[PDB]
């Protein structure tokens, strides 16, 4: 119980059932992500941050 309980019974179903598909088309994309550092350990240098 809480917040919403039944009616009615039932089971579990894929979403796709209720998915209104659209024409929506996107591109989205992240260009180059980069981060570099030292293999074994972090090199502390107590800047820091």
């Amino acid at each position: 119980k809480v917040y919403l309980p039944p009616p009615s019974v039932a089971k579990v179903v894929s979403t796709d059932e209720y998915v209104t598909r659209t024409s929506i088309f996107y591109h989205a994309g992240s260009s180059r992500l980069l981060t570099v550092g030292h293999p074994y350990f972090k090199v502390p240098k107590g800047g820091n941050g």
Binding site: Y3, L4, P5, P6, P7, S8, Y18, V19, T20, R21, T22, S23, I24, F25, Y26, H27, A28, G29, S30, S31, R32, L33, L34, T35, V36, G37, H38, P39, Y40
Partner: protein
């Protein structure tokens, strides 16, 4: 002795996407079911009501 040796690690990266957004008409039991999956979404849609 004249030379200090150092060890450094590197990364470069790219995500690319195509979305199609979907609409879901909320109906209550569904909503509850969705709620029962996670309400938070619904709040976070604010499916409401207040």
């Amino acid at each position: 002795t004249s030379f200090k040796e150092y060890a450094r690690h590197v990364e470069e990266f790219d995500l690319q996407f195509i979305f199609q957004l979907c609409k879901i008409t909320l109906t209550t039991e569904v909503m509850s079911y969705i709620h029962n999956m996670n309400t938070t979404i619904l709040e976070d849609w604010n499916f409401g009501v207040t």
